[PDB]
Amino acid sequence: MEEVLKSLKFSLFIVCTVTLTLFLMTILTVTKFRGFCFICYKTAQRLVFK
């Protein structure tokens, strides 16, 4: 954690660039969500083992 704390100094600039990444990674999840919506409970059911 110590290192990272100091890395923020330079990493700061990266943020501005990572900004777009958030939106990009979002569009990819938006689609997958369509199927994940089912697998979520579909898999949880067996996981609970009623």
Curated annotation (Swiss-Prot):
**Which tissues does the record link to its expression?**
Highly expressed on the basolateral surface of intestinal epithelia. Expressed also in other cells such as lung epithelial cells.
- Membrane-spanning ranges: 10-30
Where does the record place it?
Answer: Cell membrane
Family affiliation: Belongs to the Toll-like receptor family.
Q: Which disease is it linked to?
A: Systemic lupus erythematosus 1: A chronic, relapsing, inflammatory, and often febrile multisystemic disorder of connective tissue, characterized principally by involvement of the skin, joints, kidneys and serosal membranes. It is of unknown etiology, but is thought to represent a failure of the regulatory mechanisms of the autoimmune system. The disease is marked by a wide range of system dysfunctions, an elevated erythrocyte sedimentation rate, and the formation of LE cells in the blood or bone marrow.
Q: How does it assemble?
A: Homodimer. Interacts with MYD88 (via TIR domain). Interacts with TICAM1 (via TIR domain). Interacts with UNC93B1; this interaction is essential for proper TLR5 localization to the plasma membrane.
Function, in words: Pattern recognition receptor (PRR) located on the cell surface that participates in the activation of innate immunity and inflammatory response. Recognizes small molecular motifs named pathogen-associated molecular pattern (PAMPs) expressed by pathogens and microbe-associated molecular patterns (MAMPs) usually expressed by resident microbiota. Upon ligand binding such as bacterial flagellins, recruits intracellular adapter proteins MYD88 and TRIF leading to NF-kappa-B activation, cytokine secretion and induction of the inflammatory response.
Which protein are we looking at? Toll-like receptor 5
Which stretch of the intact protein is present?
A: 632 to 680 of 858
